[PDB]
Structures are given as structure tokens and as C-alpha cells.
Amino acid sequence: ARSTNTFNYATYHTLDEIYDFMDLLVAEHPQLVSKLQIGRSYEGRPIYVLKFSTGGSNRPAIWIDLGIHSREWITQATGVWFAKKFTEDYGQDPSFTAILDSMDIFLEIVTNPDGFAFTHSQNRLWRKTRSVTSSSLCVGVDANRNWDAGFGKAGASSSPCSETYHGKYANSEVEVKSIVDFVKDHGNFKAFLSIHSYSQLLLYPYGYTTQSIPDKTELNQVAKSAVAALKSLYGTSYKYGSIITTIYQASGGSIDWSYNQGIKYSFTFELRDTGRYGFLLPASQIIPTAQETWLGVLTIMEHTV
Numbered sequence: 001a002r003s004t005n006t007f008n009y010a011t012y013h014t015l016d017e018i019y020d021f022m023d024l025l026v027a028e029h030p031q032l033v034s035k036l037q038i039g040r041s042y043e044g045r046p047i048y049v050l051k052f053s054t055g056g057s058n059r060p061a062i063w064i065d066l067g068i069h070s071r072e073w074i075t076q077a078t079g080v081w082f083a084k085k086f087t088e089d090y091g092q093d094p095s096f097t098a099i100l101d102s103m104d105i106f107l108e109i110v111t112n113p114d115g116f117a118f119t120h121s122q123n124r125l126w127r128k129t130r131s132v133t134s135s136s137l138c139v140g141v142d143a144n145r146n147w148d149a150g151f152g153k154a155g156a157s158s159s160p161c162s163e164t165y166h167g168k169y170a171n172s173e174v175e176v177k178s179i180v181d182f183v184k185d186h187g188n189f190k191a192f193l194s195i196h197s198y199s200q201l202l203l204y205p206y207g208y209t210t211q212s213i214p215d216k217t218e219l220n221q222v223a224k225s226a227v228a229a230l231k232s233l234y235g236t237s238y239k240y241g242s243i244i245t246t247i248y249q250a251s252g253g254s255i256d257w258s259y260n261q262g263i264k265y266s267f268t269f270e271l272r273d274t275g276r277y278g279f280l281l282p283a284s285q286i287i288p289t290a291q292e293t294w295l296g297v298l299t300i301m302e303h304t305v
Contacts, residue, residue: 004028009290010082011283012073015045018110021080022048029087030101038108039178042131044209047111047178052086053104054277058188062301063263064106065179066195067146068143068178068254068305069156071128074281074289075195079109081290082297096298100305103190112143112175123281127163128293129173136160140168145195146176149256150208155249166252183261191265191304193297198278199270200238202296205259207243208248215264222303223267230296232290236272238296243268265304271292 001007004024013021026033032052038046053059068077073085086105089096099105110116114130128140138161145156148170152158156166183189204219213219223240230238239263243250255266272281274290 003082004087009077009084010231010286012077012286013080014120015110015113017071017077018080019048020208021083022050022126025083025087032087032090034084034147038182039174041113041175042129042173043114043117045117045174047113048108048110049182050083050107050109051104051106052095052100054090056104056238058186059102059104060104060190060304061104062191062193062304063106063108063189063258064193064195064297065111065254067109067116068111068175068194069196070112070119071122071125071279072197072271073279074197074286076110077286078176078195078271078290078293079107081287083107083109084253085290095302099298100299101229101303102305103282108179108266110303111179114127114175115140119147124251128165128177129263131167131213133160133168138165139237141165141173142160143173143176144196145250145252146171147180147201147252147254147257149253150251150259151208153179153208153251153252155208165205180257183258186259189258189263191267191300192255193266193300195293197267197271197275198275198281200272200274201244201246201270202238202240203246203268203270204240204255205235206258207247207253208255208256212242212246213259219267221266222265222300225303226299229299230292233295236292243281265300267300269296
């Protein structure tokens, strides 16, 4: 509210509160955090990214996006906790301190602002963007099927009314193109993590093809380690593997795109739970979910540094 120290991390927040939170955090830690606007959503809402850095010029970076699918509230709530966590652990935790002393972390808490606002306003289970097409009465695109990676192939729908509609063409959604341009312009990202829910899974490329990535052995071992670390707090069990062998074929996914850009450490997290509550995860599970997930993310970060 008035300070990130009085902000209630154990409850779900609206878009305005999360945006106010960003300004508070930047005001409290000006030498570490800065807020960047990488674009504007379809409905004109600013798209913000928090940059955590201790200095340098274009240092190797880590990308983390959450809430690309709006109804997955546990992701945006985890993102807020993450932001605060970075500021409290720098200079306290030896490992995280070493990471921030050599690398920058870019965090996008609300990747799909329009959808998020909608879930609070009209439909709690809305997942797509809110772009309109004259071609249909239906609204929105599945932003995680809109990337240029096997775009339009099996694992996505060509129907505008579908929950998995991929869009008219790759990167048609400004919420996606804003990330694409930013990452390509930066040119020095080493890891790309996209957070979702639910299912308790840690996945790596690919989803659109059965082809195995040349870094499978390494990513599979990193995934195994991250899962072990995450489980150490509350015993939460995760499964890991490539997207297509673990779930099913899925085209136009973000990490398939990032990996094809040369970002080796591309992973997607599917948080709690396994179905008991699903997308409506109780607010009482926010902090413990965030705490365990942190352990997994840091593990991946340690391997990138």
C-alpha cells in the first residue's frame, strides 16, 4: 500500500495495485530496480518490465515473464513476490548476490494486461488477449500460440472463437511483439523463463516438433535439479521433460521461439496445483508457492551464470 513492506503478498491484487507496487519498489530501491515500458496493450494499457541491475552495460540477462494467460492468477502474484524477494536477498544470499553482481534480471509480472483486467471485471477464467477481429464476433488470441515457432502448425486452433486461437499471423499480438522486439534488440539474453499454471511441471523445448534439442542432456539435468530444489520446501512434486513428450504437441510457444533465437536456457513453469483448485488456487497458497518456485528458478539461474 504505502510501502512494499505493508503490501499484502498473501492475497490477489488488481492491475492498478500491481502497477502501484512497481513504482513503490523502484522508489525504495532506485540503485537496483528501474521500470521500463516496452509497449502498450491492445486496449492501450502500458506494458511494464522491471529491470534489476547492479550496473554495467548490456550485461548477460535473464528474462522472466508471468501471466501471459490472464486467468492464471498464481503467476502474477508470484511475480510480485519475486520482485520484492530480489531486493531483500541481494547482499544477504551469497548465491543470488553473485548472480546480480554479474547479470541483469528482467521481470514482466503482467504480460497480458487486458486479459488480466478482464478476469477481474467480467470473466475470471478469460485467458486470451482482447484484440478484436472484424472477421469474427469472438475476441482474443492465445498469446502463447502467437510466437514465430512452428506458427500455425498442429497444436493450435485457426478458429478465432477457440481458446487456443493462434492469431492471423506470427507476432500479430502487440503484447507478444513487444517482447520479441525488446529481446532481439537487447541481444544478450542467456535464459528465458515463462511462468504458467497449473500442473506442476518444468518443461523445455520443443512443443511444436518431435525433434530433440541439441542441448537436451544439459537442460534435462538442470530441470531435474530445479525440481529437486523446489520440492525441498513443502514436498511439492513436479514432472519435467520436453513440451511435446510431457504434454502434447503445441505450436507457437514462447520458449520454442526463444530457444531458436539462441537462448539456451529456455524453460516453462506450470505452478500449483494438480487440479484440486486449478486456476482458482486459494490465496493461502500464494507465499508457499512463490517460495518453492524461487528455489527452482534460482537453481536455473546458478547454471546460467
